[PDB]
RNA sequence: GACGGAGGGGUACCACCAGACGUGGAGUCUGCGGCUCAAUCUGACUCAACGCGCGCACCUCACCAGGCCCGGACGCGCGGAGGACCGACAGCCGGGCGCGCUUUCGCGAUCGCGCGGGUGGUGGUGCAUGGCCGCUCCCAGCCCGUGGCGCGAGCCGUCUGCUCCAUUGCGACAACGAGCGAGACCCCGGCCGCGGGCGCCGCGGGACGGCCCGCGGCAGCGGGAGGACGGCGGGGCGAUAGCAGGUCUGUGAUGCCCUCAGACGCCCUGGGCCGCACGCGCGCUACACUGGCGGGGCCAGCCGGCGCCCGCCAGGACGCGCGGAGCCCCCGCCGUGGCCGGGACCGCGGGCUGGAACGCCCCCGCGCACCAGGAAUGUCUUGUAGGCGCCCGCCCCCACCGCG
């Protein structure tokens, strides 16, 4: 469900100039961004309602820390597929925060917005290097082995 | 915004009331003596369960639209595990025919329309659900 | 045993036509490949599986054929003097039609 | 002995290389044996 | 922990005495080009080219100040 | 001629051998409209087996996988003509090459 | 979206087994030709085989009659329609260097009365003659007394542990069976002659 | 050389810290001794036997209780063609086939019979062996040419120093010059470019103890910054020398051996491997409220066919190419009561796959232990432990395993 040719297929562009991507643990959030009316229908679901309520604040965190001065009047259509229930939510944060810094990136506001990004998480600015690990030839799991016999 | 702006699950209770209220479909009388799935040994006890299932069926169909969605695909979206066997639990399918009764009856109500492979939400269906979008946000 | 006479003539001519009889090595009754021709007068298709195999040991011990079994399938080949035995017993007066197809031309690898 | 020979019909899988009636390993229609496989896999082509 | 393998150290010494002027004290990439510059030297694989390059930049420091 | 498209499929397991074939196949497209390469999602038939011929020893498993690779191009040109174009393509050994008509459904 | 039946993806597997079956027949009947490797080239169902051999005429022998009996034996065996099967043998330069030819040329002396150390050095002579960095002959089995053991005779440095090992070195195992019991012989030849790769340890300097 | 309840130095969750997840206690699973049988086929016993030799109704099958038929090829000597031998309905017989028996009908040399030579044989000896894994060996050791050194075995190089993942380097240095192993290399990933697209897949870069500062002849270290990545990222091969380690039961691997026609051949029918007082090794699920439980909302990756009426369901009919997991989470229910925890057994059924249930699936019951585990041990440092699901190996059917 990720790294697909059709990461974003239906969109015909029409002003979605800022194109972003979020990789957070084998999950991609691809966000085309237009200077619209603050509509972030990630996965065609308004940011206001997300599947894990407790984790809505984490998705709101890129929009809230950055502030409405650049966020308001900017709409990003994010497609999230691949990964799990909350791994996707971190990918959504990656897409939203990269995008608003990337709507004023040429202007020096990149340094102030990156400062907001690095005080919160360097992971919002830089992708997660953590995925999964190979199972052992004996026993189950990368770090676990069958209980030994005598001795 | 028909189901996007509203929580589709919140709409599920409101249109569950609307299914009996508008008289869409009926309770098939097997709603008393049958269980939802082979995985779900628990028998549904809501008594309006076929109305929530027939609110779920259209919500699934509406977003997919004409994606030729078939009865089994709808049934395997509420799949659970089978417990009660010492062997490790594994996911098992929901009853296809209880769901199949829903869709075949819904065909007449015009929220379900004949198509290649599976049936789709009819254009008439696209209109009925749209009204509750305004009702939910108002 | 007491296998039909036609098979003896059928294997000889086929063995010489391809100048070999690689044989499926099966001690189980089933489709019998290779000598689909056992003449007629009783069959219009392949003969019994046992017949070719029992005959093949007789031919190999006498020396009419040479066998180099590799994988499950056998790799039987008509031998140098087999050509005289096959041609003489079939009553072919002269050297008949064997298997050469000219000389191959240099290939890309 | 027309009736007696091979009255029984059963799947008769065999290691094509080995003829084994066990460890056939027909994952892809291949019958290279569980053990016979490494020896012959180099020509067939398999990689670690 | 990093200590260089003999193959890297030996070749690096040759590359520091073959050309001190051409190599650079801190710029690893300038040395990297001289390490893999066909006739000047050939390192099979970039990682080995990188390995010699790191040392030839440190060796360049050594040669610049009180050479061993 | 019959200007019928022939889909191009090359099944070669050696990624490099098949890579040599791709560059020559693209070259003959100058003769007749080669399409952009559609290299296959890698297919890795997988066989994992106990290394020991007997059962003795700690279970040790040898992991065996060979990636058969398919290369896809689409070429529309005369049906007899494509066979001549393949004369130009390199015949390095052990590659299966097929061209299949993308015929407008006979109607 | 794509169809996954991909019917054709098993034929190249059947071809892969065929190459295997072709190797097992060849090392049985083409030992005196120094058989090393066999190739399969069917594009239009046109069967092409390039056998590698110490000297190629050794395979044809008599105006291709020897080859043709076995060319149409291959056809018969593989249900290939007769005459489609074609073998163009290629001649092998540096015949001794190729490992499969060398291990066989030992079995040929050993099955008679030649000494082991004498033919170990005889095989080593060919590998130095063929520019191999080193040649190692390992004989195993019931040599001398019935309690068996192995003699390892290596001349010149030889490598065998790493990825270069499967790029430069070559090897083969001949299970010679003698009159007392099985005395398998295996000769490895390390050749840094390959121009397909350069040892990542090897470095060249101005 | 091996040992040292001998120093001085190393070192690792196959050791212990610091901790976690456990097991052992309990149902059940899968083996292993023991018991019993007609047979309960066999190897294998600390590590390095014991879900190991890859799902045993049949085949497999090696085992047992039977039953058929040679496929004894090739010579040699002979016997023999209206005939050597091979078959055969009627009944009986033996589960049963003319298998034998009465009975008289065939049948064509494809041969009868010895004499040598046979096809064989999951029959024995891994203590005759080849190969191929295990283990020493998550440890870095191994050796070579020429020269020292001693009569020689055997040292030197191969070092107490000085670092390291490492005989990784460094500096000294009767030794001097090498090499194999290590590392490299290779395989997926991190990122970042382009080519190029029926599927995201081909090719490059980049990370180098490089850069900063301390402390060090040096090797390097230790604290930094930037950076996809920080100093091997789980990544596979396998130095030298071997061990009565296993397997003749994986094969036209093989020595001897042993049988070879009333066969240890090979087919067939039925059974046994699982029967199973008892002890044990991985395992599964329990012992509930950080939880069973009514739906809703789901969200994957090794990577995937899906659809219509008939059925609670298991499952079918008829079809055509098609379309994704639980955990968790939102809201009900129940109140610590062996309880609605838990599902072990047991009785009717509905099934399917199959020649043939004994196998498995479903449903309506029935609700075993078990309330947290004695001695004693096992496994691990971040996407890790655990927690939870998914395909496949093997399969007529049939995961509590195995690789992922």
List, as one string, the DSSP characters of E6-32: HHHHHHHHHHHHH-TTTS-SS-HHHHH
Chain D residues touching residue C28 (CB < 8 angstroms):
6, 12
Query: Exposed, middle or buried by CB within 10 Å (0-12, 13-18, 19+), for C98?
Result: middle
Distance in angstroms (rounded) separating the CA atoms of residues G35 and G39: 12
Residue ranges of alpha helices (H) inside B22-122 are 49-64, 71-75, 96-109
Number of domains in chain A: 1
Distance in angstroms (rounded) separating the CA atoms of residues G58 and G66: 10
| Resolution for this experimental structure (Å) | 6.5
Smallest CA-to-CA distance from A47 within A97, A15, A92, A81 is with: A92
Instruction: Give the pair of three-digit tokens for residue G93.
Output: 């330069």
- Extents of the domains making up chain G: 8-91, 99-190
Smallest CA-to-CA distance from C75 within D39, G31, G88, G71 is with: G71
D35 closest-nt by C1' vs CA: H250
Q: How far is the CA of B75 from the C1' of H179 (A)?
A: 69
**CA distances in angstroms from A47 to A19, A51, A76, A90, listed in the order given:** 18, 10, 10, 13
Provide the shortest C-alpha distance from residue D24 to chain F (in Å). 12
> Of the candidates D16, D29, D45, which has its C-beta nearest G10's C-beta?
D29
Chain E residue whose CA is closest to G200: E44
Q: What is the DSSP letter of A43?
A: G
G154 has which bridge partners?
G136
Distance in angstroms (rounded) separating the CA atoms of residues G57 and C62: 30
Q: Which nucleotides of H are covered by protein (CB under 7 A)?
A: 14, 22-23, 27-28, 43-44, 46-50, 52-55, 58-61, 67-75, 84-88, 96-97, 107-112, 119, 122, 128-135, 163-166, 168-171, 179-186, 189-192, 195-212, 217-222, 228-242, 244-247, 250-255, 266-269, 281-286, 292-315, 319-330, 332, 342-344, 355, 361-364, 367, 377-386, 388-396, 399-404
- Do C and B make contact, counting contact as 3+ CB pairs within 8 angstroms? no
G202 vs E: CB within 8 A? yes
Q: How far is the CA of A95 from the C1' of H328 (A)?
A: 24
Query: Residue C108 domain-assigned?
Result: no
G139 closest-nt by C1' vs CA: H130
Judged by DSSP in three states, E55 sits in helix
> Which CATH number is associated with domain G99-190?
3.30.1140.32
Chain G residues touching residue F95 (CB < 8 angstroms):
43
CB G141 within 8 Å of CB G182: yes
> Of the candidates C28, C29, C71, which has its C-beta nearest D17's C-beta?
C71
Instruction: Give the pair of three-digit tokens for residue C36.
Output: 């689909």
Distance in angstroms (rounded) separating the CA atoms of residues A78 and A41: 7
Nearest residue to nucleotide H394 when comparing alpha carbons to its C1'?
Answer: D25
F45 vs C: CB within 8 A? no
E strand residue ranges, chain C: 65-67, 76-78
Q: How far is the CA of B82 from the C1' of H287 (A)?
A: 20
Provide the shortest C-alpha distance from residue F98 to chain G (in Å). 8
User: Among A5, A137, A149, which would you mutate to test the F interface (most chain F Cβ atoms within 10 Å of its Cβ)?
Assistant: A137
Chain G residues touching residue F72 (CB < 8 angstroms):
none
C105 vs F: CB within 8 A? no
Instruction: Using DSSP bridges, classify how beta strands G169-174 and G151-155 pair: parallel, antiparallel or unpaired.
Output: unpaired
User: Among E6, E10, E11, which would you mutate to test the G interface (most chain G Cβ atoms within 10 Å of its Cβ)?
Assistant: E11
Residue ranges of alpha helices (H) inside F1-107 are 15-32, 79-88
Q: CA-based diameter of chain B, in Å? A: 50
Which residues lie below 8 Å from residue G205, measured CB to CB, with a gap of 6+?
E11, E14, E15, E18, E41
G113 vs E: CB within 8 A? no
Number of domains in chain C: 1
Distance in angstroms (rounded) separating the CA atoms of residues A18 and G194: 51
B72 closest-nt by C1' vs CA: H307
Query: Residue C98 domain-assigned?
Result: no
Instruction: Using DSSP bridges, classify how beta strands B120-121 and C65-67 pair: parallel, antiparallel or unpaired.
Output: unpaired
N residues, chain E: 68
Distance in angstroms (rounded) separating the CA atoms of residues D30 and D13: 11
Owning domain of residue A60 = 17-151
Owning domain of residue C78 = 1-93
Ramachandran assignment for B58, one of left (phi > 0), alpha (psi -120 to 50 degrees), beta (any other): alpha
- Do C and G make contact, counting contact as 3+ CB pairs within 8 angstroms? yes
CB G61 within 8 Å of CB C12: no
Which residues lie below 8 Å from residue B120, measured CB to CB, with a gap of 6+?
B61, B64, B65, B66, B67, B68, B69, B112, B113
E42 has which bridge partners?
G204
Q: Which residues does a gap of C–N over 2.5 Å follow in chain C? A: none
Judged by DSSP in three states, B21 sits in helix
Q: Which residues does a gap of C–N over 2.5 Å follow in chain F? A: none
F4 has which bridge partners?
F77
Enumerate long-range contacts of B80-83, CB under 8 Å, 24 or more apart. Answer: B80/B37, B80/B39, B80/B40, B81/B39, B82/B38, B82/B39, B82/B41, B83/B41
Contact G205 E41 (CB under 8 A): yes
CB E48 within 8 Å of CB G200: yes
CB A99 within 8 Å of CB A82: no
Which residues lie below 8 Å from residue B21, measured CB to CB, with a gap of 6+?
none
The whole-angstrom distance between residue D8's C-alpha and the CA centroid of its chain comes to 20
In angstroms, what is the C-alpha Rg of chain B? 15
H helix or E strand, kind and range, residue G91? strand G90-91
Instruction: Give the pair of three-digit tokens for residue B88.
Output: 């490790």
Phi, psi of A18 (to 5 degrees): -85, 110
Kindly report the CATH class assigned to G8-91: alpha beta
CB F13 within 8 Å of CB F69: yes
CB C70 within 8 Å of CB G35: no
Which residues lie below 8 Å from residue C33, measured CB to CB, with a gap of 6+?
C23, C24, C46, G79
B4 vs A: CB within 8 A? yes
**CA distances in angstroms from E26 to E29, E57, E66, G100, listed in the order given:** 9, 6, 17, 52
Contact B5 A44 (CB under 8 A): no
- Solving technique for this entry? cryo-EM
Judged by DSSP in three states, F52 sits in coil
Instruction: Give the pair of three-digit tokens for residue A19.
Output: 């194109």
> Of the candidates F9, F91, F96, which has its C-beta nearest G15's C-beta?
F96
Provide the shortest C-alpha distance from residue E6 to chain G (in Å). 10
Provide the shortest C-alpha distance from residue D22 to chain C (in Å). 15
Specify the residue for token string 């163009």: G88
Contact D28 G10 (CB under 8 A): yes
Which residues lie below 8 Å from residue A20, measured CB to CB, with a gap of 6+?
A30, A31, A32, A33, A76, A95, A98, A99, A102
F60 closest-nt by C1' vs CA: H133
Query: Residue A110 domain-assigned?
Result: yes
DSSP code string of G24-78: HHHHHH-TTTT--------SSS--EE--EESSSHHHH-STTHHHHHHHHHHHHHH
Specify the residue for token string 């509509």: A39
Contact F64 D45 (CB under 8 A): no
CB B119 within 8 Å of CB B113: yes
Q: What's the first-to-final CA gap in chain C, in angstroms?
A: 50
Nearest residue to nucleotide H119 when comparing alpha carbons to its C1'?
Answer: C57
CB A25 within 8 Å of CB A90: yes
E strand residue ranges, chain F: 3-12, 43-50, 61-78, 96-101
Distance in angstroms (rounded) separating the CA atoms of residues F67 and G20: 18
Where b means 16+ CB within 10 Å and e means fewer, F36-59 reads eeeebeebebebebbeeeeeeeee
Smallest CA-to-CA distance from D31 within C65, G71, G20 is with: G20
CB A6 within 8 Å of CB A13: no
Chain D residue whose CA is closest to G18: D44
Instruction: Give the pair of three-digit tokens for residue B48.
Output: 């309006």
Count of CA atoms in the C-beta half-sphere (13 A) of G163: 7
Smallest CA-to-CA distance from C53 within C71, C76, C70 is with: C76
């Amino acid at each position: 469900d990720l790294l697909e040719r059709n990461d974003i297929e239906v969109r015909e562009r029409d002003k979605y100039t800022v194109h972003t991507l979020g990789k957070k643990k084998n999950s991609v959030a691809v966000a085309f961004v237009k200077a619209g009316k603050g509509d972030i229908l990630v996965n065609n679901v308004p940011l206001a309602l997300v599947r894990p309520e407790i984790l809505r604040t984490k998705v709101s965190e890129p929009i809230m820390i950055l502030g409405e001065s650049l966020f308001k009047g900017l709409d990003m259509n994010i497609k999230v597929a691949g990964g799990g229930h909350v791994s996707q939510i971190y990918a959504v944060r990656q897409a939203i925060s990269r995008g608003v810094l990337a709507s004023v990136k040429d202007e020096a506001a990149r340094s102030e917005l990156r400062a907001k990004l690095v005080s919160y998480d360097r992971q919002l600015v830089v992708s997660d290097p953590r995925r999964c690990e190979a199972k052992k030839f004996g026993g189950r799991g990368a770090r676990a082995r069958r209980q030994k016999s005598y001795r | 915004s028909s189901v996007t702006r509203v929580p589709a699950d919140v709409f599920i209770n409101s249109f569950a009331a609307h299914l009996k209220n508008r008289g869409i479909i009926k309770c098939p009388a097997f709603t008393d003596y049958v269980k939802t799935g082979v995985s779900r040994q628990y028998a549904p006890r809501d008594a309006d369960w076929f109305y929530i299932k027939a609110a779920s069926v259209i919500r699934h169909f509406y977003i997919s639209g004409s994606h030729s969605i078939g009865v089994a695909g709808l049934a395997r979206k509420y799949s659970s595990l089978q417990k009660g066997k010492t062997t490790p639990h594994h996911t098992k399918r929901a009853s296809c025919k209880v769901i199949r009764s829903i869709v075949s009856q819904f065909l007449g109500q015009k929220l379900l329309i004949a198509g290649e492979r599976g049936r789709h939400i009819s254009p008439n269906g696209r209109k009925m659900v749209e009204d509750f979008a305004e009702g939910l946000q108002k | 045993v007491h296998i039909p006479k036609a098979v003896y003539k059928a294997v000889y001519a086929h063995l010489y036509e391809n100048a070999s009889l690689a044989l499926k090595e099966y001690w189980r009754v089933g489709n019998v490949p290779g000598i689909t021709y056992v003449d007629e007068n009783g069959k219009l298709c392949n003969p019994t599986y046992l017949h070719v195999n029992c005959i093949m040991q007789s031919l190999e011990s006498r020396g009419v054929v040479k066998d180099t079994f590799a994988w499950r399938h056998h790799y039987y080949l008509l031998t140098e003097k087999g050509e005289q035995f096959i041609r003489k017993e079939l009553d072919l007066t002269d050297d008949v039609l064997p298997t050469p197809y000219s000389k191959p031309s240099i290939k890309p690898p | 002995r027309e009736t007696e020979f091979c009255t029984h019909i059963a799947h008769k899988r065999e290691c094509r290389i080995c003829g084994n009636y066990n460890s056939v390993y027909r994952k892809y229609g291949l019958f290279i044996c569980r053990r016979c496989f490494k020896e012959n896999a180099g020509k067939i082509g398999f990689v670690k | 922990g990093k200590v260089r393998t003999k193959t890297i150290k030996r070749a690096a010494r040759k590359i520091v005495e073959n050309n001190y002027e051409s190599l650079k004290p801190k710029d690893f990439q300038n040395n990297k080009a001289i390490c893999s510059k066909r006739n000047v030297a050939i390192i099979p694989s970039k990682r080995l080219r990188n390995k010699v390059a790191g040392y030839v930049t440190t060796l360049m420091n050594r040669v610049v100040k009180g050479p061993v | 001629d019959m200007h019928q498209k022939y889909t191009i499929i090359v099944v070669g397991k050696d990624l490099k051998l098949v890579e040599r074939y791709v560059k020559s196949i693209v070259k003959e497209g100058r003769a007749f409209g080669i399409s952009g390469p559609c290299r296959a999602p890698v297919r890795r038939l997988t066989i994992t087996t106990r290394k020991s011929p007997c059962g003795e020893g700690t279970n040790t498993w040898h992991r065996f996988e060979l990636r058969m690779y398919k290369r896809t191009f689409w070429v529309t040109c005369g049906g007899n003509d494509i066979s001549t174009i393949l004369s130009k393509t390199v015949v390095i050994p052990g590659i299966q090459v097929t061209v299949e008509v993308e015929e407008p459904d006979n109607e | 979206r794509r169809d996954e039946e991909n019917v054709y993806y098993s034929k190249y597997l059947n071809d892969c087994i065929m190459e295997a079956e072709l190797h097992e027949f060849f090392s049985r009947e083409l030992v005196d030709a120094g058989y090393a490797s066999c190739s399969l080239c069917r594009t239009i169902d046109s069967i092409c085989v390039i056998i590698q051999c110490a000297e190629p005429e050794v395979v044809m022998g008599d105006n291709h009659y020897r080859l043709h009996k076995i060319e149409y034996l291959l056809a018969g065996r593989f249900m290939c329609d007769p005459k489609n099967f074609n073998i163009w043998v290629d001649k092998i330069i540096k015949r001794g260097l190729s490992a499969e030819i060398m291990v066989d040329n030992l079995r040929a002396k050993l099955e008679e009365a030649m000494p082991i150390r004498r033919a170990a050095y005889s095989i080593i002579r060919t590998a130095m003659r063929a520019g191999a960095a080193g040649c190692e002959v390992i004989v195993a089995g019931k040599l001398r007394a019935q309690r068996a053991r192995a003699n390892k005779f290596k001349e010149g440095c030889l490598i065998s542990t790493g990825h270069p090992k499967r790029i430069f070195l070559a090897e083969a195992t001949r299970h010679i069976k003698m009159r007392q019991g099985v005395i398998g012989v295996k000769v490895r030849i390390y050749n840094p002659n390959i121009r397909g790769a350069v040892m990542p340890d090897k470095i060249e300097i101005g």
